[PDB]
Assembly symmetry: C3
Homo-oligomer: 181 residues x 3
């Protein structure tokens, strides 16, 4: 059975033997990353012929977020369990994409508001959910030692979603939504 009922009184296991309340900042950080992952899965379900080029990298992002969640669930001083996530190559990978997408899209002009195509709009939602997860990761960091690589990546990731959102609009010839002064 997938249900143990062990969590019925509001406590849960993390990586290692530690049992925490589900409102613990560590469990919250893990959960926000999990919710982001689910949103990314939802976003990739909206891909069409015009935007198929985005499918692979979204899948890779889900893989990377699973690793982020693992590390958030891992106490830094746990002898038996260690961090698995390293920021350097995934973050440089994001930066390459941010750079590429930023140059191909039209120069603006005004501040950009979230929206456009359904996919671009979803990528904008991904941006804001990433930022929500980031806040909770910072909450955890202020109480416990974390894998700081996760925070670097999650910071960069919301810029990725912004750039990818603009690019998704561009791919369907949809103008970005702009703030009118």
């Amino acid at each position: 059975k997938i249900y143990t009922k062990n969590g019925d009184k509001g406590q849960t296991r993390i990586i290692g033997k530690q049992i925490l309340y589900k409102n613990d900042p560590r469990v919250a950080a893990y959960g926000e990353v999990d919710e982001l992952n689910s949103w990314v899965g939802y976003t990739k379900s909206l891909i069409n012929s015009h935007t198929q080029v985005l499918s692979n990298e979204l899948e890779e992002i889900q893989q990377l977020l699973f690793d982020c969640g693992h590390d958030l669930a891992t106490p830094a001083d746990d002898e038996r369990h260690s961090f698995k996530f390293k920021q350097e190559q995934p973050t440089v990978w994001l930066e390459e994409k941010i750079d590429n997408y930023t140059q191909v899209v039209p120069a603006v002009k005004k501040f950009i508001l979230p929206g456009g195509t359904q996919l671009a709009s979803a990528l904008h939602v991904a941006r804001t959910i990433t930022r929500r997860a980031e806040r909770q990761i910072v909450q955890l960091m202020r109480e416990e030692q974390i894998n700081q690589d996760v925070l670097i990546f999650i910071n960069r990731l919301s810029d990725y979603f912004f750039a990818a959102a603009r690019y998704a609009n561009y791919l369907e010839q949809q103008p970005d939504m702009l703030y009118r002064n």
Copy 2:
């Protein structure tokens, strides 16, 4: 008029006469369940011919979540108002569905990542929003006496969404997304 403006200074009524700030953990718990309910409504709007079998139980879940919200809004020591939600039959009902859906879907293999069809992806989002509500319910529980039946149900409910998500993928012959080691 649906607006009283009574809430314009950030306070609000619960069940009974009590007035709380909108950031009170009780109001937050109620609100997270309400947001879950809205997400379930959104999810059921995505049902197609292949997945029509899921419509009725999602509607029943919305009914049950309304009852959960009521009880979260009810102080335990309120003489005039009492809990209405009982976990036993709804939770056994969920468990029956979890069991059925778990056996019909393919055995894996790897850890499952959220995604697949738009409906399955939405059900995965429902899973994570349920867990977010659960954390806030636990926050409330740590400060105030709650209807513990609500927590049992909400715990089980996220397993329901996981199982139903896999089942929704299965119903459209879509493989579950898997974590690559």
Copy 3:
């Protein structure tokens, strides 16, 4: 480049020179409004021929939310920077719409559950995300002086989404979902 990396250690700038941790209630309030804005962009991407009448006002709401976010990011005692958002005309504008939509839709009957058409369901999600942002705005208010006009507007805005959701259902001849006693 859109990424400075200045935020990689979990701190960020607001309006003016102040640097805050990303989990600061002010940054959280700003972020929740931003997430609402993205959800509104997503919602407006779902508009069809039957509901095109809702497009313009949703766009105006995104403009207004950008102004709300600005003011939430502005300390009240900052000499160099001031509040830009005034509630009176936008809120009266919402109230006019709430009144109109409330009278055209069928009288009920039972408590309304969120759902119906995909757009109506999305507008119901907008309602709950607005309320989530409202809670965080109240959290900030309890620690710092805020532009209280933002809170008035955000309070009213969730009633707008409720009314607009019902109206969106009505526009496609879809009955509201009702709670069965």
